[PDB]
């Protein structure tokens, strides 16, 4: 077992031992950790790493975990159906996509949409892009409600590519055990 895992399993073992710990957790809170156990060794280790990283979207091309699996896509689907992970299909917020893009990729997008300062810093471009989504449109799309930000979203999603983020539900519930270990 990889070093980070046994120490991780220790946390669940002692907490599930003392009878007072589950008294503050409801039935589904005990069921979600149960689903963790029935995950395979490959599936269980993947959730370990993303737990210690910051809660944000991460590109699929940016995970290189050779110690668990050379091809992680079958593993991601295992967490995807279990609800521990969510894919880009739920990525609907414009602000989340813009910060997900890299610095040079955002510059190229700014050139296409004719931004005021295409060669600014990443922060200045994001607010300009978000501001741009509030502008009106022309008969190009009719006029019922501008919705120009939707046009940016489809272009931005294609640029970003595949990405996943730790689901808050499992994250918030699982973040509720390691602190009581520290007392």
């Amino acid at each position: 077992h990889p070093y980070y895992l046994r120490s991780f399993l220790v946390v669940l073992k002692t907490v599930l031992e003392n009878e007072d710990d589950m008294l503050l957790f409801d039935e589904q809170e005990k069921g979600i950790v149960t689903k963790f156990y029935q995950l395979s060794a490959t599936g269980q280790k993947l959730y370990v790493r993303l737990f210690q990283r910051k809660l944000s979207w991460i590109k699929m091309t940016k995970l290189e975990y050779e110690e668990i699996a050379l091809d992680l896509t079958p593993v991601i689907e295992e967490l995807t159906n279990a609800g521990f992970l969510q894919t880009e299909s739920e990525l609907q917020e414009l602000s989340e996509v813009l910060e997900l893009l890299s610095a040079p990729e955002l510059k190229s997008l700014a050139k296409t949409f004719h931004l005021v300062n295409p060669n600014g810093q990443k922060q200045q471009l994001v607010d300009a892009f978000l501001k741009l989504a509030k502008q009106r449109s022309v008969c190009t799309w009719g006029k019922n409600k501008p919705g120009i930000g939707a046009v940016i979203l489809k272009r931005a999603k294609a640029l970003a590519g595949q990405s996943v983020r730790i689901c808050k539900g499992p994250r918030a519930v699982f973040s509720r055990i390691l602190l009581l270990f520290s007392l």
Partner: protein, 261 residues
């Protein structure tokens, strides 16, 4: 089989230069009445149109209606290689994906044959609804271009006040604010000097100056530019391509609440 022989290549050069910095791809609609371009902008806010008629072409022949997707940047690059006195001879074979440009020479000693690869575009049909306009303004193109270029330095939004005493632009920025006004022309009979203004109802709007700067690239096409606008309708900037057609631009006025942020 499409075959159009245009004697003045400068007109095509100017048109392609005007469309190159605002548009990437276009649906080069062709028919038996003349080229009728209607394309888009990437930012999805400005709409362009072009209506090169058939009588202007020296020789025209079109068996069937065609739709072509031509890379505007590539066509502009090809056209830049031709001089301002050649004889453009656009010709496309039936379902051949080739726009065979041919440039002749006034001294018939050097001919150029080119070819381009067509593209497949999702033809989106848009029906522009004609409407009445309140303020109609026509003025020399050079003055309008100079006004836009001058106001670009100060701010980014221009508040056009189509007042009957003279059109009055205004832009406010962090460096201050500056308003420029013109006056109607009554005695100068030259068509490249009239600033005639038409009134039905007073108007006051706001547009992004970057798009106006993009629009004014077609200044060499004609000397007189016509502006038409009304309440809560897009602005129409129209240039007349001699006796061969016209070139219209569209722009969506900024919302007042946008300036609050």
């Amino acid at each position: 089989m499409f075959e159009a022989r245009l004697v003045q290549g400068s007109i095509l050069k100017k048109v392609l230069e005007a469309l190159k910095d605002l548009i990437n791809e276009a649906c080069w609609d062709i028919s038996s009445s003349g080229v009728n371009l209607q394309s888009m902008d990437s930012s999805h806010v400005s709409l362009v149109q072009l209506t090169l008629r058939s009588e202007g072409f020296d020789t025209y022949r079109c068996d069937r209606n065609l739709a072509m997707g031509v890379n505007l940047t590539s066509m502009s690059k090809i056209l830049k290689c031709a001089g301002n006195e050649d004889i453009i001879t656009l010709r496309a074979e039936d379902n051949a994906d080739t726009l065979a440009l041919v440039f002749e020479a006034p001294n018939q000693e050097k001919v150029s044959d080119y070819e381009m690869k067509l593209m497949d575009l999702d033809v989106e049909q848009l029906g522009i609804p004609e409407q009445e306009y309140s303020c109609v303004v026509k003025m020399p193109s050079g003055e309008f271009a100079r006004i836009c270029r001058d106001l670009s330095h100060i701010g980014d939004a221009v508040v056009i006040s189509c007042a009957k005493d003279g059109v009055k632009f205004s832009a406010s920025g962090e460096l201050g604010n500056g308003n420029i006004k013109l006056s109607q022309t009554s005695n100068v009979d030259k068509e490249e000097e009239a600033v005639t203004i038409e009134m039905n109802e007073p108007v006051q709007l706001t547009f992004a100056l970057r798009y106006l700067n993009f629009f004014t690239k077609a200044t060499p096409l004609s000397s007189t530019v016509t502006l038409s606008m009304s309440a809560d309708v897009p602005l129409v900037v129209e240039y007349k391509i001699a006796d061969m057609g016209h070139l219209k631009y569209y722009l969506a006025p900024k919302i007042e609440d946008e300036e609050g942020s």
